[PDB]
């Protein structure tokens, strides 16, 4: 009997004032939250933000919407959401969000006989996440999502995670290319501004960066060029054109690699680990070039001393490079 | 009782003309402003602007909205803001702005018994900031936000910072990697256009650029290449291949640095400090190469003169480079 359902729904929305919260003038209305994380698409060091898609569900109670004589949950057309009171929930650290609207607005309204309202949205949000890149690419980050009421203070509304630590689902399915999600945490607290105290829910993830891409992409070319630079020490000192060609080629390749690396990061004012390694390699190749320049300078009158310098450089450079690598990989791991 | 408040608000909005400002036809209405800065996402020299996110709060008194019998302040659902008069405040130097709208429009309306309205918005605006880059990267910028009334002249409306020096908070939340905030300033004034005089608030920040990255990545390579270019003065002039290789390498490396580094800024017509420094280093290395060319040209008929020229160049070039550096760093610091 759809006519009785229609009459009941018309009666529920008769004289209903959406300007007033449930239990207006009385105790705060409690709103429970749930989130299903569909995906975490892109994490950007350049923009210091991440994108996240989720199903966001709010549960509350509105005694003006209690009905009797119909033993069913009432799933209503989402446009009814424009005729009801809903919480003014927002995300504090977001930069650009939207609700999906194909084929219709991705919104759900479900009434229960006792007056309980379930209100669901599907949201894609970009959110700010400040990152500490001092140990990049061996770094670990903590990215949060902050959920707050905008207009209502703690005297009007209260938030709580519905189900405790089970209120956020789908985190274990997330696969990220550059990161892995070590842990996620849920917090509830109060925040005081000049206009009063407001409820706050926090959902935080800890991300650890995978190292394999940087081993394959930047560390190996630098190591291989540095090793290539040592072949000069095994060439006779009278082949001036070859060894000068080696020095020039190695310096040019170092500059090209450095530019291609730095063209992908923000202009931070401190030294990163990869910067330290690359300038170590540059120092090594420059020292090899200067050593050859010295040997070529003094070899005309003292060939034996030049040969001795080359022979000792055959040994010293690998040893010092191994020591530098040991120190670097012990300071960062 | 919810029905009593419902009928009170219905009486308040009955006969309310939204087309008329408070005290229309009488004394001007005073609007107090507050700004809570959440972040400055980015500052772009290429686009000559910066992105700011803030809570913008406006305070005024509308006697038509006064109510009695309820000793409470009514925090209303923000949709009621579509039925009230609000100031036509705009930002003159903004280029693209939006109010955040997830999960609902980030808007707040609070009424007080005597008729005071508090109206809050969460706004992200990209505002223009014309930059003088003559001292770049040692430059200091001043970026402003201009708040004005569009339609109402000084006869209709007045603006003032509510709280004086404390009207803007959250300045310590501004975290820019490439800048630091030195000072912020609040200004109130009037601006005359051909349609009349309008109130104007101004919020300005002074940004100081951090020099560490440019010291690390630009100045040191030029200094090191100039010093390497000085090694030719200490080499005997019979080593034509070695000295020619040194000069060519220094010249080409300077050109490569300039081409691969300067191509990253707006096409300003004037010369920046870093441009003048790089051109000075290029001039020095080119003059060293030209000096060697002349010495090689003349040394077969006047060896003593060539030796004297090299001996004096050894002393003169470092001295003039030190003088150039002293003048540059005194002028720009």
């Amino acid at each position: 009997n759809m006519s009785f359902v229609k009459e009941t729904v018309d009666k529920l929305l008769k004289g209903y004032d959406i300007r007033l919260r449930p239990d207006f003038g009385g105790p705060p209305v409690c709103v429970g939250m749930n989130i299903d994380i569909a995906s975490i698409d892109m994490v950007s060091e350049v923009n210091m933000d991440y994108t996240l898609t989720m199903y966001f569900q709010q549960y509350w109670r509105d005694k003006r919407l209690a009905y009797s004589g119909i033993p069913l949950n009432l799933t209503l057309d989402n446009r009814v959401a424009d005729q009801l009171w809903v919480p003014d929930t927002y995300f504090l650290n977001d930069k650009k969000s939207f609700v999906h609207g194909v084929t219709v607005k991705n919104r759900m309204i479900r009434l229960h006989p006792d007056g309980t309202v379930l209100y669901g949205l599907r949201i894609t949000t970009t959110a700010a996440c400040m990152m500490d890149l001092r140990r990049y690419p061996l770094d670990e980050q903590n990215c949060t999502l902050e959920i707050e009421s905008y207009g209502y203070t703690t005297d009007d509304i209260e938030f709580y995670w519905r189900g405790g630590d089970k209120a956020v689902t789908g985190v274990e399915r997330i696969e990220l290319p550059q990161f892995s999600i070590v842990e996620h945490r849920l917090v509830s607290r109060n925040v005081v501004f000049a206009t009063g105290a407001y409820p706050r829910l926090s959902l935080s993830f800890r991300l650890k960066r995978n190292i394999g891409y940087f081993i394959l992409q930047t560390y190996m070319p630098s190591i291989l060029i540095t090793i290539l630079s040592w072949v000069s020490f095994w060439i006779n000192y009278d082949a001036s054109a070859a060894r000068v060609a080696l020095g020039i080629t190695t310096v040019l390749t170092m500059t090209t690699i450095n530019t291609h690396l730095r063209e992908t990061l923000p202009k931070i004012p401190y030294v990163k680990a990869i910067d330290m390694y690359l300038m170590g390699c540059f120092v090594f190749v420059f020292l090899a070039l200067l050593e050859y320049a010295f040997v070529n300078y003094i070899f005309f009158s003292q060939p034996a001393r030049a040969a001795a310098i080359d022979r000792w450089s055959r040994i010293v450079f690998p040893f010092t490079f191994s020591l530098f690598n040991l120190v670097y990989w012990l300071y960062y791991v | 009782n919810m029905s009593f408040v419902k009928e009170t608000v219905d009486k308040l909005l009955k006969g309310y003309d939204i087309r008329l400002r408070p005290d229309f036809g009488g004394p001007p209405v005073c609007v107090g402003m507050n700004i809570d800065i959440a972040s400055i996402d980015m500052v772009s020299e290429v686009n000559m602007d910066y992105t700011l996110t803030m809570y913008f709060q406006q305070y005024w008194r509308d006697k038509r909205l006064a109510y009695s019998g309820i000793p409470l302040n009514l925090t209303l659902d923000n949709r009621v803001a579509d039925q009230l008069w609000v100031p036509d405040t705009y930002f003159l130097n903004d280029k693209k702005s939006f109010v955040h709208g997830v999960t609902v429009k980030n808007r707040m309306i609070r009424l007080h018994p005597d008729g005071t309205v508090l109206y809050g918005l969460r706004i992200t605006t990209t505002a223009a900031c014309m930059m003088d880059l003559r001292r770049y990267p040692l430059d200091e910028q001043n970026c402003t936000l201009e708040i004005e009334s569009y339609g109402y002249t000084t006869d209709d409306i007045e603006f003032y910072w509510r709280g004086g020096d404390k009207a803007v908070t959250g300045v310590e939340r501004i975290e820019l990697p490439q800048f630091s905030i030195v000072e912020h300033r609040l200004v109130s004034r009037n601006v005359v256009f051909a349609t009349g005089a309008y109130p104007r608030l101004s919020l300005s920040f002074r940004l100081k650029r951090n020099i560490g990255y440019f010291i690390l990545q630009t100045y040191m390579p030029s200094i090191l290449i100039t010093i390497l270019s000085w090694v030719s003065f200490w080499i005997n002039y019979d080593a034509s291949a070695a000295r020619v290789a040194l000069g060519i390498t220094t010249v080409l490396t300077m050109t490569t640095i300039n081409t691969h580094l300067r191509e990253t800024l707006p096409k300003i017509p004037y010369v920046k400090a870093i441009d003048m420094y790089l051109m000075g280093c290029f001039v020095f290395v080119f003059l060293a190469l030209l000096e060697y060319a002349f010495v090689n040209y003349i040394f077969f008929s006047q060896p003593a003169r060539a030796a004297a020229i090299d001996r004096w160049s050894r002393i003169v070039f470092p001295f003039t480079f030190s003088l150039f550096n002293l003048v540059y760093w005194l002028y720009y610091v």
Epitope: L92, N93, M130, D132, N142, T144, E146, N190, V191, V192, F193, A194, A197 | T169, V171, E172, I174, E175, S180, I181
Partner: nanobody, 105 residues
Framework: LRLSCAAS????????MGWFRQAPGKEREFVGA????????SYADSVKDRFTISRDNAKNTVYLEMNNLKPEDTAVYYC??????????????????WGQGTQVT
Amino acid sequence: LRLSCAASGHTFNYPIMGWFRQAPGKEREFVGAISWSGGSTSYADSVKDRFTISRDNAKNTVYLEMNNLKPEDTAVYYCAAKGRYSGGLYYPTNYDYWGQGTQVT
């Protein structure tokens, strides 16, 4: 007189340090706040131009220098850390990690 607050651990997640003082009969009172990186200080009215706050990241320390003391500056002093999205700068509820109380007469 000079008070030093040295912080260790995850100082990146708590980029703001604040100073408070508790009187024997009054509640906790905000004194000043300092940003670890930006070095942008903020002060309460009662200690403007008299107290100064400085930060050094070398050993992660913040210094409160107190000058021109008064008998109304006899309170137990605390240092605290504030989260990145913790709200207003003047409210003790918004500060998570509190140091040990220090007495000044």
